[PDB]
Subunit: 143 residues, 4 copies
C-alpha cells in the first residue's frame, strides 16, 4: 500500500473546504492501494463561455488530486509543493462530472512525478497530465 | 496589428460572465499592440486550503487569457481549441492580485503557440506557461 | 491491429540510416500489436561529460520512436509532424542500453498524442515523455 | 550578478569534448551577463530522415545549453541535474546552424527554471523550450 498518512474521504474533503477546491465543486471521491480519485461537475462554475468544460479548470483538477496524492505518500511532517505541470486536452466535455485519477510515476526522496488521467462519465479520456512535485520537510524553520 | 477581431474589455468581460472565468474573479483588464492581460484575486476562491494561490488555478488563468488572445488574432469564421499547456510555478503568492499577460510566440495557419507570464502586484514573476492552440475554420 | 502500414524492423532501420537516428546508435528493436520500441547505447556518443546518459539525447530517442510510431498508424499519403514534447528524467543511467517504448494515448483526425517510457537494462524507468504530433495529408500539403 | 563560476568559452568547449555534445557538433559560442549560447550544425548528424532538423535533437541542444548555464550560476562544489523539459517545434529547419540561448527564469535554492530559445541563422525562431533543474551538492561526505 502506497499511503503513509491515514485518512478518510470525508476528512480529505473537509480539509479542502473554503478553498479553490470546494469553490470548483471538486470532491475527493475514491481511492485504492496506489491511486486516488477526485470528481468535478461540468457546469457554469467550470465551463468556458461556450458550454464546455474549461480546459484550464481541468488542469486545476489534476494539480489538486496529484498534490494531495503526493502528500499522502509521505509521513507526517512532510508534504509537497507543485513545481510544474503539463497537460493535453483530448476532447471537449459538455455535461456530467469528470473524474481525475492520480497514479505515481516516481516517488523520489526530493522529487515526485505523478500521472493524472481525467475521464468523462462515459469513461473517455478527456485530459492527460503529468505533475512534478518537490518534497519538503515541514519542520524546517523558514517555511 | 496583431488583432483581427474588433473588441473592447467591457464586451470581453460580458462574454465571460457566468462561467469559470467570472467564477474565479478573473477580469480581462488591459491590452496593447500584441499583448493582453487579465487579473485574478488571490483569495478563498483561488487559494489552496493552505492559504497560497492554487497553482492549478494560475493555469486556469493562463489558459483563459491565452485562448482568448488566440481567438482575437483570427478573422471571423475562425476560432481556437486548447490542445496543450504546461507551466512552472516559481513562487508562492499569499495575497493581492496577479496579472497574466499573453504574448504570441508563433501564430501559424493551423497552430498557435502563446506565452503567458503571471506576475504579482509587486511585479514579481510567479508562474510561466506556454499554451498550444489548434486553429479551426468553422465556415470553410 | 493498431498499424495501418505494413513494415519490418529491417525496413525501418534502413529508412533511418544516415541520419540523427543512426548517428545516435538508435535501433528500432521490437513491436507488438499496440507498442513499438527502439534501443540506444549509453556510451561516449550519448553521455553528458560526467559519465551519465545525456537527458536531451534520451528525449531525442523518445521523439524518434514516438514519431515513427505515429507515422505507422496512418494510411499511405499521410504522415506526422512533431509539434511538442515534454519529459521528466527520473534517474541517471551509466551504462548498457536503454529502451524506449511508444504507446498511443489518443489518435485523432488531426492530432496524435503519444506516451513514451524509457527504461534501463534492469527495467527501471529512467525517463517518461509525452509527444504531440500533427497529422498532415501529403496530397494537399 | 548571474555567473558564480569563472569560465571562458574554450574551457566550456573543452569540458564537452568526447561526449554527446561534441558528437552532435554543438559548440558553446557566446555568452552575456545573463545568458549563454551554443550552436549546432544542421546536417546528417542532426536531421531526421525527412530531411529537416530532428526535433528531439533540438531538445538535446536546449537541455545541453540550459544545464551548462545552470551549473555556471552555482558556486564551485555545486551543480545541476535535469528534472524535466518541454519544447514546441515552431518551424522546420533544413540547413545552416541553429543557435540556442539559455536565459534564466528563476533561480531557487533547490530548483532552477531556464528559458531556451533556438533560432536559425536567419534569426527565425524555430524552437522554444523550458527546462527545470535540481541543484545538487557535490561536496558532501560521507554522508
Amino acid at each position: 500500500m502506497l499511503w503513509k498518512k491515514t485518512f478518510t474521504l470525508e476528512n480529505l474533503n473537509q480539509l479542502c473546504s473554503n478553498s479553490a477546491v470546494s469553490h470548483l465543486g471538486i470532491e475527493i471521491s475514491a481511492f485504492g492501494e496506489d491511486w486516488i480519485e477526485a470528481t468535478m461537475p461540468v457546469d457554469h462554475r467550470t465551463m468556458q463561455p461556450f458550454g464546455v468544460l474549461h480546459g484550464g479548470v481541468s488542469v486545476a483538477l489534476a494539480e489538486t488530486i496529484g498534490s494531495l496524492a503526493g502528500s499522502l505518500c509521505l509521513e507526517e511532517g512532510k508534504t509537497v509543493v507543485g513545481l510544474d505541470i503539463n497537460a493535453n486536452h483530448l476532447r471537449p466535455v459538455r455535461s456530467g462530472k469528470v473524474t481525475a485519477r492520480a497514479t505515481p510515476i516516481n516517488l523520489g526522496r526530493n522529487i515526485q512525478v505523478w500521472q493524472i488521467d481525467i475521464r468523462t462519465e462515459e469513461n473517455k479520456l478527456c485530459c492527460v497530465s503529468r505533475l512534478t512535485l518537490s518534497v519538503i520537510n515541514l519542520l524546517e524553520h523558514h517555511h
